[PDB]
């Protein structure tokens, strides 16, 4: 049982050796699930380098189900090393393209530096890999209107959402009087004031909060004040819009359409990085479980309603190309980032500040499209004949 | 290996013993793969030597299925399934026919991407593909120009004549239509353009029933009035490739549209695209991954006319509708299927087939966003 | 000259007699250009050639116009008649919306003033109502006087239908254009003295008659404004507004020029003085700058009843703005202004008595704009005596 | 009355010469259809054989109420001559400016400008090249319509086509007015129903004839020609129509376009078109016949939707600042109506990039800059403006 997998790693196995082994596999030591195991070997060498049959068994016990099919490659891309290599020619050429504008308008997004690319990546597995700038914080902007939606969802269902807002791109309000899809202000305004109603903005953040801590298996998610204080100020549009869905009658009833917008501005301030965020990304890859806590986080009809619309509504008025040519769910923001998702895979977290006239980041759009060239992971591709592209799950 | 085959099925295995054991594993005894065993059965109980004789030729085949290795492994539950689907959306008497069809006859035909097939309803009735061959001959298009040259000519996305660029929105509606049939087998005449389609169809359905009516062509080309004024329209813009006759095109494009199927024959089709350009009851080439892809792509978004949005959606699946009722359907890595009745809803959709595609993705995990390992209480036919 | 006009009106004549005639006419004695005439009259029962030369004295042109039938109607009596007419014919048509309930009967006036200062009214033409939208106009009309067409129309455009082509509101009369006009309306001072200021203005255009503000509809309208809050921001985002605005509170600003009240009686001057190229009728006095005046007009033509615009021009053809409270601001250059008042509305929110007004004026007199003055077949021409 | 007339213009007797070079100083032409007994009069009074009272009442007496009104400056534009010197510089003005482009290109001769007027009294003027045949086109809009209005009122012509400024379809699923060439082809099929088009044209022909007191009007082949080879667009527009039921029950479609075509080939000069223009101008009355040629509603409806949708895009801005009915074409004509003083065509063919000759538009602008003929101009106030009535 654990004595098989202890074979498969002699009369004793250094320790170093199944670490090595371990982190092989894109696991990271620091996984929750393999909390047990790497207390029960730091303890081990405590007591003590060398592991007898009896001792792995006594580390490797409690985590046994999932080393296992690390050891025996059953995760969805069991030769990891490979792939990532592949992820690594693909961002240093991406990150060749100096193209496109940091966004100006104010002055927390005009600081950040043109240089800055980072791509992260978590399967559904747990499986973890990074390269460039992927722990520096930025906000999530309209990255966040996918997972609030989500949210909403999850807790209202399909139905009373969609009384509010539209399942469709437009290609202010379609022909029903609502906005037409969660991922344009207009409609993402409408799914904020569906959020947790009856209550203040500070349990309504809070209440998110949570949500998106769990997507990110309690990864780094954060706030920024000085990004809320200057999209607040510079709000104009926004409070066109929101006067625009009070007077159409566009809210639920009893709704406070400033308030509304505040907590907007607010959860467009939210931070994270490439790594977090890739996380987060991955729970909508693995239909709703946080594919490194195996906790459920959002319903399966959450989550397919979310990826339905990043696949239509995701990346502003490239949507429509995006979806020809890339066909993965994604959400860019003004920022830099691009949420990125291959269901039943993995996602991504892609970060450049530089944005291209569309409003999407350059590097990552350039990414993205390389991605898909090299592997099979275009939504209509087939996973049996593939012509020349490469399968890594195989 | 033949040996282990025949052990699975006493001394000897009746004819009759094998035979109903391989239909129930979803293909059907005249599968063309399945040919040389077949002729070897009619050249003759089998004992061991008998067996092996006939079955050695198809062997890998007819190991993939009797081990269960199919795309749908039970698929005589997968079928109960597409029946109770079928029997629900034929309670449903509403719609208009459009206008010479009986309302009431409603058929359903799948083909898994490994030949496995099904039928319930009215499902050798040959009626017009109408606007179910756009794709076919967008993925025609794609195969033999390339995805770059052909959307020179025609957008790659929904419209909501021509758009931004001055191309039609996307080759789902009428103008993309039109302008894609002017690009296939261009300078030759529409004789050999038809017969050329006729045989890239002939592969797409595994060489099974596909015809053409004169009937609706004569009608069709009388009554085209707004294609006409499409084409006037197109040509005036410069739409077309250098050299085009256009007068000519909307003929062959009313031709297209005129070309025949029955649900069998186009589920196959569907199955096609289903397999990634391989057709599954030959093993045939046909068209490359890149034709395929972009089509699958076009009928998600455009597929189901004003309906495309609100289908992609809820059913979350490439589909293709037509004026006769017929609803070309891909489940990728799965199955094609042909759902036909005649009566249409206002949107142009057949009644049923619309009713049966959202059954179809309320029960099983085939919605292109559903996840294969967290589906809730969902079926997965693969199982 | 003062003699010539005694004797067309014995050795003495009453004064009574002089009141008649005059009134005949269609001038009404209050006339702010008769009063010399009628303070010299109060000095003085009879009026013999001295007495009469010395009260007529001061105004002798305007009357002889007056009574040798010189005014642009000569026959004026014949012509209220028929504005009566026409009155009573759109008074039953009873339709439109302002389980309501109801304590008192519909209102309905009409008054005519025109380009000559002659006066009519029926109905209920001294009842206060609020402009709304037909302030559009008048505040278009001062900004173009004081800042000229070019400035302006940097500013908003100048065709029918929230921004056109280049990013400005489409025209003057639709609510996106008429916030920013009403921006670029003395800019040096804070909001009370822009209101008074533009309040002058009115009385000059009215000839000092009625005009005056409704609280109570102006913190309705601050109440309802959520619609022309999202335009506010909107056009702020689009930069829209001339440099160093205050956008919320050029929308208040807005809110209190859409609650200033008329009559159908001094507002028909209002449009007396547009029909008469920019000179108050009554007061001769010269209001606004003839630019400012034709461009109103022209705007009023193509834009001047919300989405009726189009209809309106090509039956009735003459420039027009209607508002909520029920009031059609009317104008037929070179004749006369009109204010016609009936509050309920129709489907496209014009008065429907206004409305009906209108076309059947048309109908009866060879007014509309592309009329020939030659040859009109059945129509009457007032003109003409 | 021919004694006062006498009178006024004498002295003993009246020389021929003097009587004629005052006649022609009030902007009448001698050739006048209205002038015809008293000119033939004064030929054959000169064959039998220095006018006296007697001789020159023979002459004058059977035209003697249109004479008295010329000599008695009773016409719309009483000082003519002084009107006509402003129409010459606003002429010099608009031709220094040679922009456009006519409807790498070879050069065999000076482009072509002229502007001719004609009063609603019948008063004329031209400069510039008039005599010149040119095909009316879009020009002819608002004279097919005024005919479709005139034989079938109103409400049948507006029950085909729309009345405002503007897909080829309005919320009625009609055009949008009679000026564009969707409207302008459904107007089309509604005139002389139930006979074939050379009938029709015939009968068009006949109307453009008595708009344009008979002066030129003709046609041009090659022109017709040219437009049936390029019409992929208006094909467009009639299978469009045709689809959505827009013409009247019975009408053979590509039949009715090639009577389109027809119409667009029509040609005139700038000199009878402005008598077409002046018939607007009178209220449906040809001003140097006499004659009533058009009904006053069909009159009235063609002026509003000139004013509002005559000029292309140009329209709403052509409006505002110029603010007169007027129609242009691609020939580079502009036809243009001042309401109870005058018609006119402008001809230049390079246009801007709107499709309006460019001097033509220029001509138009300086002409209302210049007097108070603007449509909501004020008669009575009026600032550096001129006004030619007074
Ligand atoms: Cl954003
Ligand atoms: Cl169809
Ligand atoms: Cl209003
Ligand atoms: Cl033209």
Redesign the interface.
């Known amino acids: 049982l654990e004595d098989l997998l202890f074979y498969t790693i002699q009369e004793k196995i250094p320790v170093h050796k199944f670490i090595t082994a371990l982190k092989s596999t894109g696991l990271r030591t620091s996984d929750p699930r393999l909390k047990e195991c790497m207390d029960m070997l730091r303890l081990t060498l405590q007591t003590t380098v060398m592991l007898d049959k009896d001792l792995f068994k006594k580390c490797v016990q409690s985590n046994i189900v999932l080393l296992t099919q690390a050891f025996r490659r059953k995760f969805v891309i069991p030769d990891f090393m490979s792939f990532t290599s592949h992820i690594d020619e693909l961002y240093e050429s991406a990150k060749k393209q100096s193209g496109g504008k940091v966004a100006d308008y104010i002055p927390q997004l005009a600081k950040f530096s043109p240089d800055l690319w980072g791509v992260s990546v978590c399967t559904?597995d747990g499986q973890r890999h990074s390269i460039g700038d992927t722990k520096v914080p930025f906000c999530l902007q309209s990255c966040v209107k996918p997972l609030k939606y989500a949210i909403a969802v999850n807790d209202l269902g399909t139905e009373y959402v969609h009384r509010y807002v539209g399942?469709?791109?437009?290609?202010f309000l379609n022909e029903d009087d609502k906005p037409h899809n969660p991922m344009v202000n207009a409609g993402a305004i409408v799914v904020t004031s569906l959020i947790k109603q009856g209550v203040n903005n500070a349990e309504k953040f809070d209440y998110v909060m949570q949500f998106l801590n769990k997507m990110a298996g309690n990864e780094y998610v954060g706030f920024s004040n000085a990004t809320f204080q200057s999209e607040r100020e510079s709000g104009?549009?926004n409070?066109?819009?929101?006067?625009?869905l009070?007077?159409k009658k566009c809210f639920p009833e009893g709704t406070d359409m400033v308030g509304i917008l505040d907590f907007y501005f607010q959860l467009c301030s939210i931070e994270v990085t490439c790594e977090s965020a890739s996380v987060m990304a991955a729970t909508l890859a693995?239909?709703?479980?946080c594919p490194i806590t195996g906790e459920?986080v959002l319903?399966?009809?959450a989550?397919?309603?979310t990826?339905?619309?990043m696949?239509?509504c995701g990346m502003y008025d490239f949507?429509?190309?995006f979806?020809?040519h890339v066909?993965l769910?994604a959400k860019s923001g003004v920022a830099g980032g691009i949420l990125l998702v291959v269901?039943?895979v993995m996602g991504m977290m892609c970060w450049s500040p530089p944005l291209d006239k569309m409003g999407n980041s350059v590097k990552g759009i350039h990414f993205c499209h390389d991605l898909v060239s090299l592997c099979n992971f275009?939504?209509?591709?087939?996973?049996?004949?593939?012509?020349k592209?490469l399968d890594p799950r195989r």
Not at 286 to 289: A, C, L, R
């Open positions: 559904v399942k469709e791109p437009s290609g104009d549009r409070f066109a819009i929101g006067y625009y009070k007077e693995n239909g709703g479980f459920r319903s399966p009809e989550v397919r309603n990826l339905s619309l696949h239509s949507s429509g190309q979806a020809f066909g769910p269901p039943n275009h939504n209509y591709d087939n996973l049996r004949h593939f012509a592209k």
